[PDB]
Amino acid sequence: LQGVELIARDWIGLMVEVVESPNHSEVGIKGEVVDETQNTLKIMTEKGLKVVAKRGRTFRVWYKGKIMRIKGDLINFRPEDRIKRGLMMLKRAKGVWI
């Protein structure tokens, strides 16, 4: 339910943590998203700033009392685009055809 909402919502302002990545040294990067583009997430960490690509990455995200794991491959699209994708994932997660 809420996990799907994250597919459509920009992640700016949310707390995230990189748990999987093809760029191995990125594991552990955790902080607040301060900017987002179709392909990247800019994160403010405890000791600095990091830019992390979305493709191939898996992020743990703190949202409305829950903690979800979301693949960057699902959100590396423009906002308008992510809105339609969000709805698709909702139908799929609802077992509804439309």
Curated annotation (Swiss-Prot):
On the tree of life, the source organism's domain of life is: Archaea
Look at the named UniProt entry and state the broad enzyme category this protein falls under: hydrolase
Record Pfam families: RNase_P-MRP_p29 (PF01868)
EC numbers for this chain: 3.1.26.5
Tell me the GO BP annotations in alphabetical order.
rRNA processing; tRNA 5'-leader removal
Q: What is its main location?
A: cytoplasm
Question: What GO cellular component is one of the record's annotations?
Answer: ribonuclease P complex
Q: Keywords in UniProt for this one?
A: Cytoplasm, Endonuclease, Hydrolase, Nuclease, tRNA processing
Instruction: Name the reaction it catalyses.
Output: Endonucleolytic cleavage of RNA, removing 5'-extranucleotides from tRNA precursor
Location in the cell: Cytoplasm
Q: Which InterPro entries does the record match to this protein?
A: RNase_P/MRP_Rpp29-subunit (IPR016848), RNase_P/MRP_Rpp29_sf (IPR036980), RNP1 (IPR023538), Rof/RNase_P-like (IPR023534), Rpp29/RNP1 (IPR002730)
From the UniProt record, which GO molecular function terms apply?
A: ribonuclease P activity; ribonuclease P RNA binding
Query: What HAMAP family would the database entry show?
Result: RNase_P_1
Q: Which family does it belong to?
A: Belongs to the eukaryotic/archaeal RNase P protein component 1 family.
Subunit structure, as described in the record: Consists of a catalytic RNA component and at least 4-5 protein subunits.
Q: What does this protein do?
A: Part of ribonuclease P, a protein complex that generates mature tRNA molecules by cleaving their 5'-ends.
Q: What is this protein called?
A: Ribonuclease P protein component 1
Q: Provide the organism lineage as a comma list.
A: Archaea, Methanobacteriati, Methanobacteriota, Archaeoglobi, Archaeoglobales
Gene symbol? rnp1
